[PDB]
Design a protein around this ligand. Structure first.
Ligand SMILES: COc1ccc(/C=C2/C(=O)Nc3ccccc3C(=O)N2C)cc1
Ligand SMILES: COc1ccc(/C=C2/C(=O)Nc3ccccc3C(=O)N2C)cc1
Ligand SMILES: O=C(O)CCC(=O)C(=O)O
Ligand SMILES: O=C(O)CCC(=O)C(=O)O
Ligand code: NI
Ligand code: NI
Lengths: 287, 287
């Protein structure tokens, strides 16, 4: 059984139900090739200057990722395409509201460009969030997913160049005795296609076997506003924040958040008032 | 069986183990009377100007609290005593590190002064966090507490003036069929004493029966850094933040946070570096 493939345009309402059932779906043309081109051009130099994940200069080193991986997060100040087009994606917001309605508001836990160098080895089969959110392992087995990951192709994803592996149905597994690469299928994708998985989907980066190809992806971990993001937008200039839509501001934590509790008292509030009301935060003011 | 009473000075190591077992403990002299006096003087006018919890001017109204309740949160910009003495409390930090070591770093989910007017009615018996963090209800029954609440007396707590009710052992209850005021005992406290409960302890504010007395408390909900605070310090002037200790800065979300994962990749980071390193955030710079 291959990963279900759905149109971002025509199959929008089917995307979350498909992931809830199978643990994975390919969203064809999640981003237009124009958005992919602009995002690639904007992040290009930041990928080139990025040190190894566990660089000795870093006070929060990533000791997990391969030395042939470059990860660049906090994309809002880097990329106009990201903070305007991606953060306001109609498809992303329909899927996230479908997924997280039981919990309430959602925001970006991490938006990162990942670039894998030629001959990058396959990652071990894993669930996400286990190096940042221990709390997730204490959730009841059948608890609705508290985060999902859009793995957006910024270059071709082929079997040969290390396309992502997923185990379909593995998001519902309690016993992990049958976890093996034998159980996996591949996310073959054109640039702009996205693999959508949950925080419980067992998956891994594939082995780069050509020895010539550089694979790049945009990973958008969307999570309930009750969970702390892996990344901070606290240092993003206020002029950049005030250039965004109110919705994009909320996704970067520059707004108060609401739970789905019938008489919700809210998150990141200030004496009964929102961040945006208190700070008089402007929106859609061009730079 | 009455609520166990412990000295902040002499019984420090016994406090968290006592709450883990019984679901509640009284910390005698948690704050000195001097700190209580200074905090009361500093918040006094902010309590007086505070509207009803569900005021029509508020875009995050609290529809739960009685109209005879005034709640003032985001205390850092209001109170020197709070941001210096309370946020750096040796007793608070030992208890929180004892409670949350399985999860990692902790911070303030809410620090609020609550003032109850004369003849304030008893609250319904409840667990905290159910109007802000639906995720907590999806945790496995025996999951370690992800938040605890220091209910610090800023005035006398008597049976007559509505001292808090707790059900001892109720933090371990799955079946709530035996929940009744018949099962409760009272937190009788002098100013500076604190009632410590978990997010699972069944408790309620008591009925004010004198018709003359105003009861005031400082409620400090301490929670794992993986859960989003009820309140935001985003609007607190940077000069005020830079006057605090690095530890106080972390508690207000003006620092990156760490999980207890052996190879933790951190929370609120910026491309492998902390908020404080990135923003060049100064500490202990007097105003
Ligand atoms: C080589 O083996 C691995 C490498 C990574 C993971 C998983 C994570 C993670 O939990 N979260 C994310 C989410 C998006 C992108 C990257 C990461 C990441 O950095 N790590 C560490 C597991 C196994
Ligand atoms: C009248 O009945 C009530 C009133 C309050 C609660 C509980 C909460 C809550 O979950 N969190 C806190 C934590 C500290 C102080 C106040 C509150 C608060 O405002 N509410 C609503 C329950 C029942
Ligand atoms: O490289 C990939 O396709 C997946 C990367 C990943 O799953 C991860 O780093 O968590
Ligand atoms: O009034 C009290 O002592 C307790 C208040 C409380 O439990 C609450 O508001 O959540
Ligand atoms: Ni992963
Ligand atoms: Ni309460």
């Amino acid at each position: 059984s291959q990963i279900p493939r759905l149109s971002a345009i025509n199959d929008l309402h089917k995307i979350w139900p498909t992931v809830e059932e199978h643990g994975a779906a390919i969203i064809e043309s999640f981003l237009s090739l124009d958005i992919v081109r602009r995002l690639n051009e904007e992040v290009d130099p930041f990928v080139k200057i990025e040190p190894i994940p566990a660089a000795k200069t870093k006070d929060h080193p990533n000791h997990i990722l391969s030395t042939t991986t470059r990860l660049v997060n906090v994309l809002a100040p880097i990329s106009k395409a990201y903070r305007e087009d991606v953060l306001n994606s109609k498809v992303l917001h329909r899927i996230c509201s479908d997924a997280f309605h039981v919990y309430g508001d959602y925001w970006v836990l991490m938006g990162a460009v990942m670039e894998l160098a030629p001959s990058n080895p396959a990652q071990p089969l894993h669930r996400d969030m286990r190096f940042s959110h221990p709390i997730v392992e204490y959730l009841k087995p059948d608890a609705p997913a508290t985060s999902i990951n859009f793995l957006v192709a910024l270059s071709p994803f082929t079997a040969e160049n290390g396309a992502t592996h997923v185990i379909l149905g593995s998001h519902k597994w309690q016993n992990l005795s049958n976890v093996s690469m034998d159980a996996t299928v591949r996310a073959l994708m054109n640039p702009g296609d996205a693999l959508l998985i949950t925080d419980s989907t067992i998956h891994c980066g594939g082995a780069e076997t050509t020895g010539t190809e550089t694979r790049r992806l945009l990973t958008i971990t969307m999570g309930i506003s009750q969970l702390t993001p892996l990344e901070s937008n606290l240092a993003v200039p206020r002029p950049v924040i005030e250039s965004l839509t109110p919705l994009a501001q909320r996704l970067l934590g520059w707004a108060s958040q609401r739970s789905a509790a019938p008489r919700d008292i809210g998150l990141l509030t200030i004496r009964g008032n929102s961040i945006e009301k208190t700070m008089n935060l402007k929106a859609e003011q061009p730079l």
